[PDB]
Amino acid sequence: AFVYETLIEVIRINTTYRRVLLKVSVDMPRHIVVDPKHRYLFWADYGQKPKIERSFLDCTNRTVLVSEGIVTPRGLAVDHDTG
Amino acid sequence: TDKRVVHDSGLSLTEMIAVDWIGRNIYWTDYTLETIEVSKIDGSHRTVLISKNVTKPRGLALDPRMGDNVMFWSDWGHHPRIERASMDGTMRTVIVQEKIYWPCGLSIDYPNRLIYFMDAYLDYIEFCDYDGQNRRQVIASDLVLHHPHALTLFEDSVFWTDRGTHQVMQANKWHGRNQSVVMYSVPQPLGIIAIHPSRQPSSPNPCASATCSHLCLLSAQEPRHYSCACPSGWNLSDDSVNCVRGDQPFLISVRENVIFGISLDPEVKSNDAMVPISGIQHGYDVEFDDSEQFIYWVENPGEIHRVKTDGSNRTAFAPLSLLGSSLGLALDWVSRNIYYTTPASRSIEVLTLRGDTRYGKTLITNDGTPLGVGFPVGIAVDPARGKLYWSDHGTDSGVPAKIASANMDGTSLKILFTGNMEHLEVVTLDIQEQKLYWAVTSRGVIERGNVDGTERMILVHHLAHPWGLVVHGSFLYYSDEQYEVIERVDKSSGSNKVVFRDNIPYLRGLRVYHHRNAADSSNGCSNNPNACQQICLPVPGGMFSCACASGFKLSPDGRSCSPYNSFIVVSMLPAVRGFSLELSDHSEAMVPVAGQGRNVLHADVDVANGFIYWCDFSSSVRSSNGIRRIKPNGSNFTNIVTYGIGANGIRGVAVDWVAGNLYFTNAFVYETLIEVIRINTTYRRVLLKVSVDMPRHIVVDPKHRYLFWADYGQKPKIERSFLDCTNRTVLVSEGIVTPRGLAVDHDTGYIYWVDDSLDIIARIHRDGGESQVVRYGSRYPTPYGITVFGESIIWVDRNLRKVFQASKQPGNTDPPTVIRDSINLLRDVTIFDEHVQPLSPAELNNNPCLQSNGGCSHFCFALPELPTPKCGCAFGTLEDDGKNCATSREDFLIYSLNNSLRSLHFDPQDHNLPFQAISVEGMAIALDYDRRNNRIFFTQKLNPIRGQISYVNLYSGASSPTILLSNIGVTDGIAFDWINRRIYYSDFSNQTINSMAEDGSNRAVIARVSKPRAIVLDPCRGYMYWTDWGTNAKIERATLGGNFRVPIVNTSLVWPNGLTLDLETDLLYWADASLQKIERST
Amino acid sequence: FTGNMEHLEVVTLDIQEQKLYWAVTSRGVIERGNVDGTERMILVHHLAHPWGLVVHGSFLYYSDEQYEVIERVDKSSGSNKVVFRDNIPYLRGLRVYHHRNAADSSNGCSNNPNACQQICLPVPGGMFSCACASGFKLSPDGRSCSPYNSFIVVSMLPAVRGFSLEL
Ligand SMILES: *[C@@H]1O[C@H](CO)[C@@H](O[C@@H]2O[C@H](CO)[C@@H](O)[C@H](O)[C@H]2NC(C)=O)[C@H](O)[C@H]1NC(C)=O
């Protein structure tokens, strides 16, 4: 998180490999969780126009799951048994 | 010109103001209250117009022209937006909803009917139409914008302010192709307005013929284009022109910096039951009076403030306590009193609302019993039954955590409930059913009980931090600071729950505002108005009691008031306080002494004249050291000793009421003085000066003509002397280590001392002899001060933080008695009573100084077994008549000290001053004396360039400086010639040694010198000597005419500042300040 | 014991007579009770801030920070008083040093040395229990240790901590 923008980045463990998968200014991705079983990456945004979003493991797809009744989502968990 | 205030209260953070010039109206937005509010342009009547879906309103604009009647505002909260409404709020729409993030400011262009809006995150200026369906960019994708705030328009120009660049900018309102800077280094430019007639076009006013009673607001609604609105707390009538005033109850909520009004319909989410109170600090409690529509709260330090629910009056109404901040409030509406709680002083107090003059007293304080206040936090009152209830956290000294009851005049004390009250919040009373409700945070419960101490039960469970309680009707309302909630339940069972507000940070206590009437609740004080002189307090059975303010006592008629004349006065570093010897009297016997600069160490009293004297000490601030006197009623305060106090300060005050004298001990780093000052005069004398002894605590006895002191230095002792210190004897020399406390008894001839390094209280007889012990043990760890009254000794203990009374005879082992408990930083105690200060001759053994100071001009001293007075001179010497003073005819020293000339005696053991000290213009550096005319010649520095010469006469009666050579350089050196009657001087500023004639007539120049300082003369051998501290410092000899010049010394000299000649030995002495040595030669 | 313990200082145990002694500063008392939660009583009155307690032989020793004193009394009644030191600033707690021997006080961990891998802790009835250091768990043999593999990890600004789901 920078002052006027935010990045979503990936680093390969035990290596000097780092990449930027998303860069966005009006959205504010903050809390991120990953599901390798169903190949999804979820995040929560509590900026202006708060939301919860789903994407792929390279952020090449973006969908919004919750867009209403959500103001300050700060916490995100995933259940493998129920989806 | 004509600065005057529109809104005096209810504003917290006003982001933007708009003014409606047609409707004579004013609009503004508030960030913290999250509101858009409207009022008459004079501020008389105000209303909240939009509160739903408002989070962070920053920008506001209006078009009041006939047929437009529209307003626009911006919100930068979540889902940031620009919204349009009718100027009466009857229509609402959102016009900009996308590509918007931190929309700051709005402006309107009236010819084109365009809205100009600015964004600080996307960094743009844009304009759109009133519906938001045409949109264009003026400045966009341009680094000129960093953090814009405010916007204005004029002709084809747009002006704005930027907070990042600290700059004010002008551009073209259509394309931005021309850009300019109006201001460059503004601290931070927040708001901008443009003033010209064209910015407020004229139009018809629909309200000109309207008959709305409080507000008429422009409206976009055809056909009449106006609507009538009512202020906060009012209702609107079906006639749609008139308003009515709601008598319905409402709820008052308190928060760390705000007080709010809420409506008991939980579905009404607007906080507009009253104009909010928007500037408080440390809010805990609130009270109200409906007969005048006032809300009362407390402000630090020790002040109470009141405001009206319409905001019309706001004032600081009374001082509450000089000793600390008050915490809890209760109000009696029948007797018109306000009860408050002061935890730091550990007191419950009452103040009067009636009348033009405020009166207040203390009803309950910590007295060492479990029944008194330990640490009170909440208070409630029942006026009809004359009862007071309060909640207390207790103290480690012995007060338990409790719910306690008393009579509203303090005359009864009871403990109703205790146990399982570790963290106890406020207590409230249901008066109709007579039941007390409280909250225990350590268990998360609200509990209920009877006012008689029975039927304790839990009514609500599972709370977290219940901070506020109130009971009204069938309902109980409470606030929780961790759940951040206000909730309502049914007081019979707590079995239903409603939530009024949530997500409220910093919650505090609640009240309910309703029409409580005095006629039903009438009591004795209401039935007998104007009975008591100062305060009326109800008591059970319909009776009333009369009460008197701090420093005053009540008289046997039961209605009148008169000052106290028998009380004990106690000193602690922060204050001086007075207590009654009647243990049940919790009142303050004197108005306390407290505030900035008070570091009190000792206090003494003059009973006849009605004064208390005390000394103040500071190691870091000179002016904070001294002796000061006040009256028990706080009326007159004055400083008596401020000059010439040592680094260790004054450590003693004794007062002689017969002679009108004050004795004090002045402690320097390596010596100590005992001094006397005559009261109401500029007469001061030093009676003793000693280095290896350390006199600290001093007490005086005019009946037996003795002065006693205690010394806790090396070789500690207690000593007796005469009233002029001319005799010295030691009473205690062994078994004494740190004697810090000295008291005298007139009835038995004994002196009492306390030592904290031996943990002992002891007495010895003034004629000497054996020593007796009164209290001793592991207890009595740190007795710091003692006094004797009747058959009792009263002393103070620092560690135990207690004031004790016991019986003054050795061998008594009864447990002590306590007068006050939990007082910090204690210092000694003394007593104020006519008995301890007799003024009859038969009781004073015919003291000679009792009448007209014995005829002594300056000082009167009564020595033992002497039937006549002895007289002392503050300045000068005493004459053959034995009673007047004159200036010495013997030989003495004179020296300059800043703006004065002062005298000294060759004998170190002589403390007389040859003459009173003389005050001169500027700073004097020179002295020579003329033996023919008995005058002194001196030189003055008036500024770093200008000097002066002057002479003053000693024996020709009183005299003042007379001036010669009113303009010379900075001069410091003077010598006088008694054979030729000529004066010689050292002008530094003009590098020259000059001569002059006695009358100032004839002037000459003798030599030019680099840095001349000192001059010495021998006229009977025609020679002159002077010193020069310039490069190649030297001492030179010349002739009084200057015709020869030769160096006498030119080696090993750096700063030869002083030169002298001794004609008994023909020797020349000089002093050097850099080599730091004094040398002699021939 | 609970109730009337607003400001509660140290607790000490008389092992021979099996009695607990404590001090309540909010009332200035030293109190005594049985280890089974019975027979609560006040043994010493009128103290100011009793900071330290110790019981040895027939005597009870206590220190007071406001009286600046160390005193000895008789533990049966508190009816005799002796003063050891006075005018001592900044007093704190007391102990008594004596030859307490393990042979008499032996327990399960002393009787079964080298039983547990990491820690041995006694339990009533002469039995012993095996304990494992932070980050490790105890294995079904009752003696061995192995790292945890099922726990929840919690974050707070000053630290990260791990807790077992077995309450
Ligand atoms: C010093 O001056 C004060 C006044 O500044 C004198 O105080 C008065 O004393 C008389 C006699 O007791 C009282 O009736 C007056 O009320 C006092 N005046 C005030 C303003 O309180 C005082 O007597 C003088 N002498 C001394 C030794 O203090």
Ligand SMILES: *[C@@H]1O[C@H](CO)[C@@H](O)[C@H](O)[C@H]1NC(C)=O
């Ligand atoms: C990616 O998202 C789009 C919607 O934006 C969706 O239609 C598409 O099916 C997604 N990709 C896959 C592979 O499902």
Ligand SMILES: *[C@@H]1O[C@H](CO)[C@@H](O)[C@H](O)[C@H]1NC(C)=O
């Ligand atoms: C407030 O916002 C909610 C949610 O968008 C909406 O349903 C409601 O109508 C709005 N009310 C007003 C007065 O704007």
Ligand SMILES: *[C@@H]1O[C@H](CO)[C@@H](O)[C@H](O)[C@H]1NC(C)=O
């Ligand atoms: C704006 O700037 C352009 C370019 O310098 C210039 O031609 C034009 O005259 C300017 N307009 C005004 C009103 O000064």
Ligand SMILES: *[C@@H]1O[C@H](CO)[C@@H](O)[C@H](O)[C@H]1NC(C)=O
């Ligand atoms: C004022 O209006 C409220 C409804 O908003 C009503 O409950 C109350 O009784 C009214 N009071 C008067 C005096 O009209």
Ligand SMILES: *[C@@H]1O[C@H](CO)[C@@H](O)[C@H](O)[C@H]1NC(C)=O
């Ligand atoms: C304050 O109250 C007084 C007395 O009622 C009144 O005369 C005065 O106008 C009030 N102040 C204001 C600003 O209205």
Ligand SMILES: *[C@@H]1O[C@H](CO)[C@@H](O)[C@H](O)[C@H]1NC(C)=O
């Ligand atoms: C004593 O105080 C009053 C004010 O309470 C003042 O008017 C009076 O002048 C004072 N007396 C003297 C002697 O200064």
Ligand SMILES: *[C@@H]1O[C@H](CO)[C@@H](O)[C@H](O)[C@H]1NC(C)=O
């Ligand atoms: C003064 O003190 C001396 C002892 O130092 C004593 O002998 C003498 O009697 C005292 N003066 C008077 C007048 O008693």
Ligand SMILES: *[C@@H]1O[C@H](CO)[C@@H](O)[C@H](O)[C@H]1NC(C)=O
């Ligand atoms: C010293 O003398 C100067 C000049 O007369 C005067 O202004 C100043 O107040 C004096 N200061 C002291 C401490 O005497």
Ligand SMILES: *[C@@H]1O[C@H](CO)[C@@H](O)[C@H](O)[C@H]1NC(C)=O
């Ligand atoms: C001193 O003052 C006199 C008279 O103004 C002047 O003649 C002389 O030059 C001055 N000398 C110095 C050293 O300032």
Ligand SMILES: *[C@@H]1O[C@H](CO)[C@@H](O)[C@H](O)[C@H]1NC(C)=O
């Ligand atoms: C110092 O003074 C002596 C005596 O007057 C003289 O003889 C000598 O020349 C002087 N020396 C200097 C350096 O001034």
Ligand SMILES: [Ca+2]
């Ligand atoms: Ca910006």
Ligand SMILES: [Ca+2]
């Ligand atoms: Ca001591």
